[PDB]
Amino acid sequence: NNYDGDTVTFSPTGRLFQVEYALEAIKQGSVTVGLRSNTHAVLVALKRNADELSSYQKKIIKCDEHMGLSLAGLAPDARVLSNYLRQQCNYSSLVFNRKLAVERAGHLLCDKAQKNTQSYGGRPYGVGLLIIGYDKSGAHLLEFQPSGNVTELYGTAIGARSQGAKTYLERTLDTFIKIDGNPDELIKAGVEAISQSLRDESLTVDNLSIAIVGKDTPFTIYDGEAVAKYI
């Protein structure tokens, strides 16, 4: 109200409204789903188009051979944060000959987003990210919020109508975690999860985007007729 003019101002109840408004931009964004087993981690994203002549906005970005994320909200902010991850993944490889741990990647994103919430002039990031990866401690899935809060999960969903997919995963938890050594079945569970968040529209060939990383599987994105198999 009087305490939402900038990010540097707490409200009387101890709230940061600019951060909460940035959080709101994510809810407006298109739905995306993340889930993993012990061998593989999968991203499933519902791409959004402007109209029938337009293309479908890309939702998934590769950060390294063993890591990548899906976005929901301001796409340019996701480009900035993904670019930062690419550099940090790369610094780790060049300097230490070491693949960046997914947990440490989350810590770096948290701290980058935080600096934007405490200083005058700047603004919070207006995007939510779902990072998947496979490192020395197996498969991982993270959920980034632009407040700074990063959370390691078995599965999750962000964006508009994401609550439906998040409930489905919460039921299926005991099943999909056990899908080891079977990428196609793990993706099926993710495609079935994101289907719970759909209304009116359904999953078409240029609408659906899927990514996967695993034990002997580099981070690879599937678009177009490559995902027709899963429709």
Partner 1 sequence: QFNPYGDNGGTILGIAGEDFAVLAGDTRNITDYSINSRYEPKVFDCGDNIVMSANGFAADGDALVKRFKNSVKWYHFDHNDKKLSINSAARNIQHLLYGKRFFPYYVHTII
Partner 2 sequence: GSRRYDSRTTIFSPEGRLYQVEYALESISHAGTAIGIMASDGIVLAAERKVTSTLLEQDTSTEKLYKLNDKIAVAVAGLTADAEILINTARIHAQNYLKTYNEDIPVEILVRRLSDIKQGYTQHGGLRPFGVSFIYAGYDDRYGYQLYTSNPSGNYTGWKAISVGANTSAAQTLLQMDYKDDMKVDDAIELALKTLSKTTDSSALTYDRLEFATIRKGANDGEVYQKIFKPQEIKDILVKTGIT
Partner 3 sequence: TGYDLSNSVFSPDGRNFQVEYAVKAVENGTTSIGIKCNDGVVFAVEKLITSKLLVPQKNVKIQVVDRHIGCVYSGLIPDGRHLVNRGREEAASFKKLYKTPIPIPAFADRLGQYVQAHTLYNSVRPFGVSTIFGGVDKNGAHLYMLEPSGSYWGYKGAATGKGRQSAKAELEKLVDHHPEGLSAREAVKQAAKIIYLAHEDNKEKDFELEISWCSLSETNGLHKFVKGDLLQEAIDFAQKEIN
To partner 3, the closest distance from the beta carbon of 100 in angstroms equals: 17
53 binds partner 1 per the rule CB under 8 A: no
Q: Out of 11, 28, 49, 90, which residue is the one contacting partner 1 (CB under 8 A)? A: 90
1 binds partner 2 per the rule CB under 8 A: no
Q: Tokens representing 157? A: 């969903």
Amino acid code (one letter) for 72: A
Torsion of the alpha carbons at 170, 171, 177 and 179, rounded to the nearest 10: -140
Beta bridge partner(s), residue 144? 129, 150
* Pair 73, 127: CB distance under 8 Å: yes
Q: Which of partner 3, partner 2, partner 1, none binds 24 (CB below 5-8 Å, type-dependent)?
A: none
6 binds partner 2 per the rule CB under 8 A: yes
Residues ≥6 apart with Cβ < 8 Å to 74: 25, 125, 126, 127
DSSP assignments along 64-88, one per residue = ETTEEEEEEE-HHHHHHHHHHHHHH
Scan residues 73-132 and list those touching partner 2 (CB under 8 A): 120-121
Considering the complex, state which of residue 4 and residue 185 has its C-beta at the smaller distance from partner 2: 4
Which stretches of the chain bind partner 2, using CB under 8 A?
6, 8, 120-121
Which stretches of the chain bind partner 3, using CB under 8 A?
2-3, 7-16, 103, 107, 110-111, 113-115, 117-121, 147-149, 151-156, 166, 169-170, 173
